[PDB]
Structures are given as C-alpha cells and as structure tokens.
Amino acid sequence: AKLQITLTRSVIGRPETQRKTVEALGLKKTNSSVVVEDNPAIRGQINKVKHLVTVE
Template sequence: MALKVKLVKSSAGSSKEMLDTIRGLGLKKFGDERLVKDTPSNRGLVFKVKHLVSSEVVQQEAPAPKRRKPRKIVARDRARAKAAQG
C-alpha cells in the first residue's frame, strides 16, 4: 500500500520547515503527485503540511527510489573505460 500525495496549494510564503517537508515528500512544484510508502514517518510529513497537500491511500506499491552515482564517480568511470579502450 502507498500514499498518493499531491501538492494542491502553493507553498509560497511557507516557512523553511514546511518547504523542507514538502521537498522530503518529493514534491517540487504546484500540482506534482508522488506515490510514497505508507509509513508512520511519511504520514507525519503529510500531517505537517495537510493544508497544502491532498493524500489518499492506494493499493499500488510505491516505486523504489532510483539511486544515482555522483557526477565525480561517473566521470571517473568514463575516464577509466576510455583508457582501457585506447
């Protein structure tokens, strides 16, 4: 099970704490929707900004977050591959 969270009101004028909470839910701009795992911590984040977001429980599973390598590591790997080829 997951929570479907949507930013339905503008975050303009909100405190830094609320902006961080919205960012922690993965919402960036007005109208964004995300599926997050239905955990007590995520429910707490939603409760904190309940006047800015709408949420509903859905039967889908939340997608696993994609992990990206840091830019420095990607550049290093490319350089090593290039050196190995030629």
C-alpha cells in the first residue's frame, strides 16, 4: 500500500528467468502499475528486475 511499481521497458529480448519475476509482481502489459506493501520478499524481487521497472 506504500510502493507502486510500473513497467517501463519491454520483456522482449530478456532471459526467461527475468520474465518470471515480472509475472510474479502482477505486471502484464507495458506501463502497467500495481500497489504492494514493502517487505524483504517483495523488495528483493524489484531488485532483480531493477533495469525493467521503476519504483516511486
């Protein structure tokens, strides 16, 4: 409820390992946003796909 993650870059040309991390956050389409509460588990996920998403 305090973190909002939006998808900037596309998943084409990315390893399949990084495609499962975006699907585990709820980002289907490009420029889509979600609201999640911060925690050690959710913070390490956006740290894996840092170059594909931005956090406000």
